[PDB]
Structures are given as structure tokens and as C-alpha cells.
């Protein structure tokens, strides 16, 4: 049985993307310190421990699942789109996610807010004319107070509806004070939608929308994500495990249940 690792994860021959201090999801939404991972691609994306978010307090229900779907796709290729938000102020941002000289936010998200006196009833529609699926990612904002709610979105209680021809998610914000994170008691909640060719993404809301800037090009799940603090070395190796590289010469390995590439069967 194969029962030992070098301890490193060889840079060759699988394109191994070390996220350093960004997890995949932070790199996806675009946490200011993961701007480096934009449009990056991989066979295996290793998430380290250092990893810490550092932007607007958010939670992703269906995290491990959204995490996996992106991990497999192996590309982070984002495609901007011409969304037309008429009646609201775009590019919103904050001090808990500074960028450049001040207030910042997730590069891949567009915080809409009221336009002076009002927040109209938003209702865009974006058709998928292309020959590949689209993975839009959006969010809903939960102010912690009715005051906050009304300063930003006017309406006393907002709503976000993200429909396609076959689905229909209608989440409604939930005002309340969550624990403080980077000075905030507020939170955004990350959701998603995949649009199949010949389909139409339809966003209708009247409050709390955290609008998409475009879509993520999805290829086929050949890649994979893995958590490890294993060093990376310049070497050739085919079987990668959280522990490192283990030769695929023997038919059964017992090093770990998780591995990448032509690997010995786990025991």
C-alpha cells in the first residue's frame, strides 16, 4: 500500500492554483485582497489556512455546494454585462471593504441603493443567447435596523426575485442586528443562478438587491478544490493528496481519502 507523502504538492504537471490567503469564494466574489485571482484558471485549487475574508460581512447558505460547483469548473472567468439600472444609485461601497483611498466592495458585485427621493421597482431581464451556461451570482442585503433600511432603500422592507424560465427565488431581507464584524452588525447573503442557453435571467426587486455585474463562464468539471497547508515544490507528480504527492505505482493508497489525478485506491 502507498502510505507516505513527500509532503509537498508538486507544481507539475497539473495546473495548481495556490490561493494563499484567499479562499475560492472570496476570490470569486472579489474580496479586495483576491483581486489577483481574477480570471485565473486551474486543475486543482488548494485552499490554505491563512485565508481570511476582509470585506462586507456576508454569509453564503449552500456554501459548500456553490463552492464545489465553482471548484469543478476550474475557471474563474468573469464576463461583464450591460445591466441597466435606471432609477437607483449604483457602485455602492463601504469602509469594511476599503479599496484605493476609501470605501470599497466586492469587485464582482454592484450594490444598488436609492436615487435621492426614491428606489423604483427594479425589473431587468438578461437573455442567455450564448452556447454555454451562465452562472450569475447575486445577493440580498439585510440592514440591521429599519433606519438603515430606509436610508438606503427607502422602502420599509425590500424583496429580491431572481427568475429564469424554470426557477424562481424570492428572498426577502431580514432586518436585525447580527454580531459585529469589521465594525458591522449588518450582512449580505450570497445566492446563485445558472442560466441554460435560450433562457432569461430576470431580476425584479424593490429593495436590498446586491446586483450581479455579469456572469461566470462555466466549462466542464474536470478541476477540483482541496484544503491543505502542504508546501508546493517544483517537481513532477501525478497523484496529489492533502498531505502531498504520493506515487501512483502501487494499486492502493491509504494516505488520505482525498487526492487529485490518477491515484491509487484509498484503503
Amino acid at each position, epitope marked *: 500500500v502507498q502510505s507516505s507523502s513527500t509532503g509537498k504538492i508538486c507544481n507539475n504537471p497539473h495546473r495548481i492554483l495556490d490561493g494563499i490567503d484567499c479562499t475560492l469564494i472570496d476570490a470569486l466574489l472579489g474580496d479586495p485582497h483576491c483581486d489577483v485571482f481574477q480570471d485565473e484558471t486551474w486543475d486543482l485549487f488548494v485552499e490554505r489556512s491563512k485565508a481570511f475574508s476582509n470585506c462586507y460581512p456576508y454569509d453564503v447558505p449552500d456554501y459548500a455546494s456553490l463552492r464545489s460547483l465553482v471548484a469543478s469548473s476550474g475557471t474563474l472567468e468573469f464576463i461583464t454585462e450591460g445591466f441597466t439600472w435606471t*432609477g437607483v444609485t449604483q*457602485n455602492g461601497g*463601504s469602509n469594511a471593504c476599503k479599496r484605493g483611498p476609501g470605501s470599497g466592495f466586492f469587485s464582482r458585485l454592484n450594490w444598488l*441603493t436609492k*436615487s*435621492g*427621493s*426614491t428606489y423604483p421597482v427594479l425589473d431587468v431581464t438578461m437573455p442567455n443567447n450564448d452556447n454555454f451556461d451562465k452562472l450569475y451570482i447575486w445577493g440580498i442585503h439585510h440592514p440591521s435596523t429599519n433606519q438603515e433600511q430606509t436610508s*438606503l432603500y427607502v422602502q420599509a422592507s425590500g424583496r429580491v426575485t431572481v427568475s429564469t424560465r424554470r426557477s424562481q427565488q424570492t428572498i426577502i431581507p431580514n432586518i436585525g442586528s447580527r454580531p459585529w464584524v469589521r*465594525g458591522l452588525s449588518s450582512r449580505i447573503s450570497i445566492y446563485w443562478t445558472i442560466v441554460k442557453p435560450g433562457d432569461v435571467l430576470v431580476i425584479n426587486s424593490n429593495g436590498n438587491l446586491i446586483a450581479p455585474r455579469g456572469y461566470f463562464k462555466m466549462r466542464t468539471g474536470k478541476s477540483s478544490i482541496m484544503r491543505s497547508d502542504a508546501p508546493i515544490d517544483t517537481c513532477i507528480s501525478e497523484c496529489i493528496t492533502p498531505d502531498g504527492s504520493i506515487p501512483n505505482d502501487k494499486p492502493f493508497q491509504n494516505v488520505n481519502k482525498i487526492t487529485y489525478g490518477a491515484c491509487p485506491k484509498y484503503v
Partner: antibody
Amino acid sequence: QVQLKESGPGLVAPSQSLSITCTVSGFLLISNGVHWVRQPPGKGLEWLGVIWAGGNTNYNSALMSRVSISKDNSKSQVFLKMKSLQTDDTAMYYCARDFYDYDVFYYAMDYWGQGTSVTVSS
Amino acid sequence: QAVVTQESALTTSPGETVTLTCRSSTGAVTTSNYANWVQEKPDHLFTGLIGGTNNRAPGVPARFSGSLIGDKAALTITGAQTEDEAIYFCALWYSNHWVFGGGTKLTVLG
């Protein structure tokens, strides 16, 4: 950096139409609003109106019947158009950037333009 | 909409601690008004100083402070210097409509 410049006529005869332009740089008109402030010779400042990031505007109740703020988001230009001009309108016309803080929730006029003088004389 | 009123001019000397004030015909100046304090320097080159009542704008030296003193808003230059001579405009927000004050001329006897 932020920056606002006003380019206008300088001299227009009573009963014509004033048209100032505030060309902003370093921020987007969809991200912020742009305000118009005029300072007649030896007087205080007067707030003309404002065009919000969302395009809707809010004018000074008084002058509203003659004012009209517009903007071409793709050119980075805000437009202050006044009609039925009368001598009183001789003043410095300024456009200042509308700012709103998302964490404390307050409005403020942070970036003022350089201004452009307009004399209404026949 | 309402009428913001403030000192015509005020004459101080270097060192002293002056306090411009900002009144509302319509009543007390609350936080709802976002008291803005603009500083007009020679040849009308305006500069933002304080916003939202007491939030000091970046370049602004620490000695400038925004506050509510009773039912009117205030600005306090603590240790005025000759370089503080300027017309200090106060602006008050009343429902998507701004209303400036008459401005104050600040002399700093040098």
C-alpha cells in the same frame, strides 16, 4: 482624483438661454450626484438643484420654473440649462459633487468645481 | 425651504477659539440636517470642511470641529491662525433640498 470643471458662455444677453457644463473626472455619474451652486456678486451661495446618480433631479423651489439639470452619463457631463435669463443671474456658477456615506448615512458636498462666471447684460 | 442664518462676520486673533454658529428658521438643527460647513477662500475657490455635522473632511486640520451646540449647529476653530481668514458657509439639508447660510467673514487680526 476627483475633479469638476465648468465651461460656459461668460456673457449672455437677458432673454436667451444659459447653458453651463460640469465635466466630471475620477468618479462616475452613476455612482454619485452632481449639485449646482451659484454665487451672485457680493452675495451668499444659492443652491440651484441637483441631478442624482439615478438621473432624477431635485431643484431649488424658487428657480425651478426656469432651471433644468441633465447629464450624459457616457460623456461625464452634467448640464445646467436656464431660460428666461435676467440680469440678477449674473453670478459664479459652481457644480459640486454629491457624496453620501453608506456607513454613517449622511449627505455632503465634497468636490466643488472651479466655477465659471456668467454676466447677463444687453 | 427654511432660512439658514449665521454671523455676518467675526473677528478673532491668532490663538483664540472661535465658534461659528448655524441657525434654522424652521427650528433646531438636528442630525437630520447634515450640517455642511464649506470654506470659501480668496477669489471663490470653495473647499469642503465638515460634513454630516461633525465628520472632518481629510485635508481639514484637526483644529476644526463640527457639533450641535444647543439648537443650532456649530464649527469651532481651536487656535485660529492667519490662514483661517475666510468666508465660512454653513449648509442645511431639508428633504432633498439644500439651504446655505449667509456665510461668515472671519477676520484673524495679524
